[PDB]
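User: quick one
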Amino acid sequence: HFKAGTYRFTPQMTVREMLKLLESGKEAQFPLRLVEGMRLSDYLKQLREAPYIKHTLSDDKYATVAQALELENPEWIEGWFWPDTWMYTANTTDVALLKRAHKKMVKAVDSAWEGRADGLPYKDKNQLVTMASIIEKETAVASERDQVASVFINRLRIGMRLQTDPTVIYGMGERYNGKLSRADLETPTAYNTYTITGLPPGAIATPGADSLKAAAHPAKTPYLYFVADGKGGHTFNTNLASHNKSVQDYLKVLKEKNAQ
Amino acid sequence: HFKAGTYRFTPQMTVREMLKLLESGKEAQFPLRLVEGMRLSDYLKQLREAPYIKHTLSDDKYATVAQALELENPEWIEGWFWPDTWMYTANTTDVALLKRAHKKMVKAVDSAWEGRADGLPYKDKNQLVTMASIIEKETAVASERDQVASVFINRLRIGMRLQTDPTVIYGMGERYNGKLSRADLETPTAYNTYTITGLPPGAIATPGADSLKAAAHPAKTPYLYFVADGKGGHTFNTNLASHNKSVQDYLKVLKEKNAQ
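Assistant: Done. Structure below.
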């Protein structure tokens, strides 16, 4: 009844202690930090490069991952993995580790969904995840998260295009080279929220618990616009004319800074 | 004859193999990714949270770390650590891992220094490291790295203030809330390159091999200015008139993007 694994051998260890250790099953555990804001394709490259991972995935395509995970909806994949420092034992498969990540996300989502605020325009749980991923990728201060959420949810409710750059970046796929021009924002893809109305078909990244909570409980504001203030915050507005003013304020601040 | 450590035992392992393993010293390796562009304080936090690290440092103050590593000049600390995925065996001390990181950087810096381009304005190796950390924190696109480097080194040579924001941030220390204003830019500190001429007294982050190379071999250009082009890249200039034009060009791009 010997339990295989990675064990710790002290200098003057006894035979008595060693047999106890080799049966205890108390293995050394390895870290895999799966960080919020990253994609599954990021997580899959980490798994390939991680020490002592049994590679049971034929390739790192998303559909293969949905196959191996036996997902009910294989289009509901991105954003459905809980971000954490995951502890694994040596020779654990990639699939079982992703399975643990998926099941933990499902639980957190279901709790967020059932506890969500009244009158949100999400049709399903994937849309809550999609919105959460949009909130996560919108680079802001922690204090402004609820308001950023509010703007996007308000827009989704009334039929205004979301116009968020990360969704455009996602929709380009491997054509994105680090640059984002005006032509890129103008080219229609299924994810481009400058061209499409509503949420994109799925999430764009892995949402943190911070974003998921903001998607489920946004601030109660009438805001429909935000722009950088030039410090490193944002000014929030309810109408186009106020917004356009706040845009001019931002450019003044930038001119005063970048020009000599 | 027997070497103590953390080893892995397969289910069908023979006693022949176990004997071989327990002498070999080929332990389980644990990963720690120390990323370029991060500070030593970021690495120190990572060591506090890393599994199976023996924590010997009294505190994570840089003077403590300098004393424990026994540096000749304790002021030459920031930036002097090689960024990589470092493999450590269990029960390795925090100090021993940092010592490995330091030594590898020293070797890399010495090699960069001796092979460097002629007529660069650096007095010592710490200045090369300081400049490299400045290039590291400013470079957003890899094809523009040697030209960013060129601008800063051009300025350093002729006595034009470097006016680089990450150094203002470093100089504020814990007073930096996450936001940077005009008041922050105009307040003198030892690191503030809007007020001081030349390099700050030490590096501001860990440079990668990319930035360290660019600090030793910048592109031969007449540029003294760069500004964002509005679409991911930068536009480089030799004079203030041309730069102020490029600033105006950038502000129009932001006007078209943000205002509706």
